Amino acid sequence: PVKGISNLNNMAMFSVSGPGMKGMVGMAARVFAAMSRARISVVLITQSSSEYSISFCVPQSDCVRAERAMQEEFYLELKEGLLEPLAVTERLAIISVVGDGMRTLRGISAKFFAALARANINIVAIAQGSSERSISVVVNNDDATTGVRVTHQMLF
Amino acid sequence: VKGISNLNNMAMFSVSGPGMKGMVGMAARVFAAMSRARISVVLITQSSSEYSISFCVPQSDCVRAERAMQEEFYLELKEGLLEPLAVTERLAIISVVGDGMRTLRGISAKFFAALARANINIVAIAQGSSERSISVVVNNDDATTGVRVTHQMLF
């Protein structure tokens, strides 16, 4: 019941964290207001708990403008250490599997990750929302096509 | 835009530990164990450099999913390669679905702005790249307000 496998290459991932971040109001709202003003395409956003970093992906072509905008928006917090230094990881890619609806993603998730793990492809981040039946994984850009191939063999 | 939706009575599991960065296949093991248990995983997020994984299940599946995790990771938990499983109950997932353009630019900003204005704490976020939709995990107590205020902003 798989729809398709998609890949977006040449992405960069930002990760914002800090000891204060659990205690600060509207941190995601500020991050994404800053990206919106800078006209930056935020393709993936993930935060696994209030204590862990907010991570988000942008196309590599937007990476320098996004970093400058993040440094501007969080200047005070960074200088004071409420936020740890911004983490920027370049040369990434996003592989996604699209279901045909929600129900059958159970076997699909297990199979998707099993294929990547068999290929020894490191997963840098994961995002699956509750509305679309689709799972996105962030990998190193050099692994993108191999990741599509092994996922395709497993699922089709 | 296309809609604002709500799932109540969710539980969120978080799997964390030194072994998450450097052991092969940890997400594969988590989701094989959920699959063997016939437990639908409605949300997944992994965001930190320490590679902790969080995922949500319906509250009715919480006891069986906890047992499946304890069985799959029995040896890593005993060795301390994984820290004790974290389990948060009484959660809701609010999702916004947009149209076909990269509209989440204005959408994701305003959605998070509406929740912050309402003083609604965010428990987890997941937005994949293939859908124009964004899901946010909140306390179940805040779900009805969170939806009302995100309707007000984005409509």
Q: CB distance B127–A129 less than 8 Å?
A: yes
For chain A, give the secondary structure using H, E and C.
CEEEEEEEEEEEEEEECCCCCCCCCCHHHHHHHHHHHCCCCCCEEEECCCCCCEEEEEEHHHHHHHHHHHHHHCHHHHHHCCCCCCEEEEEEEEEEEEECCCCCHHHHHHHHHHHHHHCCCCCCEEEECCCCCEEEEEEEHHHHHHHHHHHHHHHC
Q: What is the resolution of this structure in A?
A: 1.7
Annotated domain spans of chain A: 1-9+91-156, 10-90
Minimal CA separation from A151 to chain B, in Å: 13
DSSP chain B: --EEEEEEEEEEEEE-SGGGTTSTTHHHHHHHHHHHTT----EEEE-STT--EEEEEEGGGHHHHHHHHHHHTHHHHHHTSSPPPEEEEEEEEEEEE--SSSTHHHHHHHHHHHHHHTTPPP-EEEE-SSSSEEEEEEEGGGHHHHHHHHHHHH-
| Residue B82 Cα to chain centre, angstroms | 19
Q: Residue B47: which of A33, A39, A54 has the nearest Cβ?
A: A54
Q: Which residues of B touch A139 (CB under 8 A)?
A: none
Rounded CA-CA distance B59/B99 in Å is 31
Cβ atoms A7, A144 nearer than 8 A:
yes
A-interface mutation test, from B2, B44, B88, most A Cβ less than 10 A away: B44
Please provide residue B123's backbone torsions phi and psi, each rounded to the nearest 5 degrees: -95, -30
Give, in order, the Cα–Cα distances in Å from B23 to each of A120, B35, B55, B79.
11, 20, 19, 13
| Residue B114 Cα to chain centre, angstroms | 19
Rounded CA-CA distance B120/A97 in Å is 31
Give, in order, the Cα–Cα distances in Å from B75 to each of A118, B87, B134.
21, 19, 35
Q: Residue B34: which of A45, A106, A129 has the nearest Cβ?
A: A106
Q: Which residues of A touch B47 (CB under 8 A)?
A: 15, 46-48, 52-55, 125
Q: CB distance B44–A109 less than 8 Å?
A: yes
Cβ atoms A46, A129 nearer than 8 A:
no
Please name the residue that has the structure tokens 């993040």: A70
Q: State the burial class of residue B134 (Cβ atoms within 10 Å of its Cβ: 0-12, 13-18, 19+).
A: buried
Rounded CA-CA distance A52/A126 in Å is 13
Minimal CA separation from A50 to chain B, in Å: 5
| Residue B123 Cα to chain centre, angstroms | 8
Q: In chain B, which residue's Cα lies nearest the Cα of A115?
A: B28
Minimal CA separation from B132 to chain A, in Å: 8
Minimal CA separation from A3 to chain B, in Å: 12
Q: Which approach determined this entry?
A: X-ray
Q: What residues contact A28, with CB distance under 8 A and at least 6 apart?
A: A45, A47, A54, B112, B116, B122, B125
Neighbours of B18 (CB within 10 A): 14
| Residue A74 Cα to chain centre, angstroms | 20
Neighbours of B139 (CB within 10 A): 15
Q: Residue A132: which of B25, B41, B130 has the nearest Cβ?
A: B130
Rounded CA-CA distance B124/A27 in Å is 12
Rounded CA-CA distance B25/B53 in Å is 12
Neighbours of A106 (CB within 10 A): 19
